[PDB]
Amino acid sequence: DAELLVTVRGGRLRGIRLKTPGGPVSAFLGIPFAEPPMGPRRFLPPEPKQPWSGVVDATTFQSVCYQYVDTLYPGFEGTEMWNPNRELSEDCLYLNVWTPYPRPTSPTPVLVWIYGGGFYSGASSLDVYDGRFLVQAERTVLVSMNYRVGAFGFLALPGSREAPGNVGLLDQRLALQWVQENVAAFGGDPTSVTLFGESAGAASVGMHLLSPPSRGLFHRAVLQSGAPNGPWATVGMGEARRRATQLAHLVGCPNDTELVACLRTRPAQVLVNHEWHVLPQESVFRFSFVPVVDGDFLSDTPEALINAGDFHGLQVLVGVVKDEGSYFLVYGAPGFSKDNESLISRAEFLAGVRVGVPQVSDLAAEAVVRHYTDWLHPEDPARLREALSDVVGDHNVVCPVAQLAGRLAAQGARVYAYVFEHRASTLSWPLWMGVPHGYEIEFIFGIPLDPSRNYTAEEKIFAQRLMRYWANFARTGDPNEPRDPKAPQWPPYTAGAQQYVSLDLRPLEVRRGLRAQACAFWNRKLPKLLS
Numbered sequence: 119d120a121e122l123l124v125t126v127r128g129g130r131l132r133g134i135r136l137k138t139p140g141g142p143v144s145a146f147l148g149i150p151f152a153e154p155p156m157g158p159r160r161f162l163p164p165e166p167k168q169p170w171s172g173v174v175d176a177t178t179f180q181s182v183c184y185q186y187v188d189t190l191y192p193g194f195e196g197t198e199m200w201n202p203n204r205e206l207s208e209d210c211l212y213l214n215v216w217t218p219y220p221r222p223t224s225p226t227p228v229l230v231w232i233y234g235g236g237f238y239s240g241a242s243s244l245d246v247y248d249g250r251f252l253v254q255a256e257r258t259v260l261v262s263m264n265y266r267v268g269a270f271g272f273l274a275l276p277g278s279r280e281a282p283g284n285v286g287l288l289d290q291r292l293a294l295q296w297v298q299e300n301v302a303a304f305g306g307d308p309t310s311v312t313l314f315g316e317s318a319g320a321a322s323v324g325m326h327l328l329s330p331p332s333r334g335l336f337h338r339a340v341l342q343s344g345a346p347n348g349p350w351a352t353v354g355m356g357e358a359r360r361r362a363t364q365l366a367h368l369v370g371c372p373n374d375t376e377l378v379a380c381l382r383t384r385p386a387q388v389l390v391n392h393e394w395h396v397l398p399q400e401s402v403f404r405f406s407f408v409p410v411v412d413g414d415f416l417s418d419t420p421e422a423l424i425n426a427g428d429f430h431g432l433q434v435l436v437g438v439v440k441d442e443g444s445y446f447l448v449y450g451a452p453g454f455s456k457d458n459e460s461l462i463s464r465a466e467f468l469a470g471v472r473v474g475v476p477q478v479s480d481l482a483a484e485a486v487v488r489h490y491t492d493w494l495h496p497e498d499p500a501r502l503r504e505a506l507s508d509v510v511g512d513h514n515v516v517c518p519v520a521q522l523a524g525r526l527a528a529q530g531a532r533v534y535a536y537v538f539e540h541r542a543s544t545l546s547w548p549l550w551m552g553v554p555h556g557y558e559i560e561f562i563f564g565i566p567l568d569p570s571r572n573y574t575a576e577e578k579i580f581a582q583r584l585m586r587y588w589a590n591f592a593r594t595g596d597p598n599e600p601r602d603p604k605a606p607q608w609p610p611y612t613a614g615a616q617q618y619v620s621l622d623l624r625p626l627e628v629r630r631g632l633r634a635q636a637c638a639f640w641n642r643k644l645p646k647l648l649s
């Protein structure tokens with residue numbers, strides 16, 4: 119097949135035809151975009167891939183970046199669906215391109231996916247990120263890349279040349295430069311690039327928005343369930359140095375240069391084994407090696423750059439799932455488990471707040487408890503279970519997203535906002551978790567269209583609607599149908615009105631205020647109290 123041969127700047131590629139019920143797609147999987155960041159290049163910014171002779175076979179997903187493997191529930195679908203599904207390697211900087219068949223004769227908009235996983239995990243090869251249904255349905259081009267995670271991507275000894283930090287974000291930036299240089303060979307339009315990502319992938323999209331060298335590489339952004347101003351998404355230089363130094367001592371090391379030089383001698387898995395030990399306190403939704411406010415990739419804190427930024431000419435689509443917190447509770451909140459109803463005592467709730475809002479004063483913890491307590495039913499196990507879910511979801515995702523969305527809309531950007539409220543019929547997590555973090559992704563990617571799976575007919579329709587919204591936004595910056603001269607069915611989000619839509623089997627509903635009461639607490643009152 120002629121459409122499976124493509125020449126990019128580094129040389130020739132051979133892709134693979136992929137099937138869907140609607141029609142075939144052409145896929146180029148495992149394209150090397152950087153030199154393998156191994157041995158002496160561990161912890162260093164990525165270097166462009168050198169050209170090659172002959173043909174790179176591009177028919178298989180390439181290795182996953184070295185990372186921790188979850189073993190909370192071995193074999194359970196709800197956790198395994200996020201675990202590596204290829205071998206781990208430091209040789210992992212590869213990207214993937216899905217393009218319509220036949221290849222577009224006029225350049226089509228490009229969606230660039232950045233996976234999440236708390237900056238410690240993730241892979242572009244997970245089945246739930248299968249680009250074929252999106253591309254077939256709406257005939258955009260889809261790119262996804264691997265980027266280094268954990269210590270390999272974000273260990274930072276700030277101010278040093280040997281571990282400057284943020285190199286996982288530089289991996290993403292290099293892949294975006296690769297798209298600028300090469301996506302036209304696949305029929306993509308390098309002048310119409312929309313970044314989209316979930317969780318740490320959303321936070322990453324946010325950091326490119328705020329970093330001038332990345333900002334020229336794309337035109338629009340989708341932030342699903344994450345934000346660069348989240349309390350987990352960045353660390354200070356002092357804390358970053360403290361975690362890297364503690365990691366070095368836990369592996370036996372041993373002067374910045376000598377420290378990193380010793381870290382480079384240890385096998386990858388040895389670093390991974392100690393990754394969690396460097397967190398200071400017991401927590402959920404906290405990760406050891408994350409982007410560092412270095413004065414380089416980020417000139418200032420994400421909060422400062424958001425408040426100071428001019429965002430005219432930008433369109434942004436942002437959103438959250440209905441139960442952002444629940445997934446994280448089984449990772450350390452006492453009384454919680456996927457295997458029962460997790461109907462917790464008030465004692466367990468008070469202990470859960472300390473894990474759910476780690477390293478905060480007794481004074482702040484009291485305010486949190488009071489805000490989230492119904493003092494007429496302070497002991498009700500169901501209310502307490504939901505309240506702790508809200509504590510974790512609001513503090514880590516929803517209020518950081520609401521804050522960013524308001525500042526963007528107020529400062530020039532056009533913003534659309536959603537809450538995803540449909541619980542998949544195939545969802546393996548228990549019913550008390552609701553619509554948890556990560557479980558809109560399979561609908562955005564049209565996974566219900568896969569005949570090998572068991573979704574309902576209405577869920578297949580819902581997936582097609584969502585692919586249409588996302589592709590409308592990629593094409594025009596506007597999820598509404600372009601031919602519509604009526605007032606928008608999905609209205610912009612504004613700092614004052616705060617309109618957003620519910621995404622469910624039902625038609626769109628406009629609502630206002632993304633949990634405005636909770637986010638007044640986290641973004642205004644709680645800061646003022648501790649001030």
Ligand SMILES: *[C@@H]1O[C@H](CO[C@@H]2O[C@@H](C)[C@@H](O)[C@@H](O)[C@@H]2O)[C@@H](O[C@@H]2O[C@H](CO)[C@@H](O)[C@H](O)[C@H]2NC(C)=O)[C@H](O)[C@H]1NC(C)=O
Nearest residue numbers: 448449450451452453454455456457458459460461462466
């Ligand atoms: C719900 O389960 C938690 C966790 O227990 C685990 O999951 C169960 C379904 C079962 O498989 C247990 O064998 C597991 O250990 C319960 O919280 C635990 O309670 C025990 C006392 O029974 C205590 O010793 C543990 O420290 C608790 N663990 C945590 C993480 O808090 C909880 O009581 C269960 N709720 C029920 C049954 O209503």
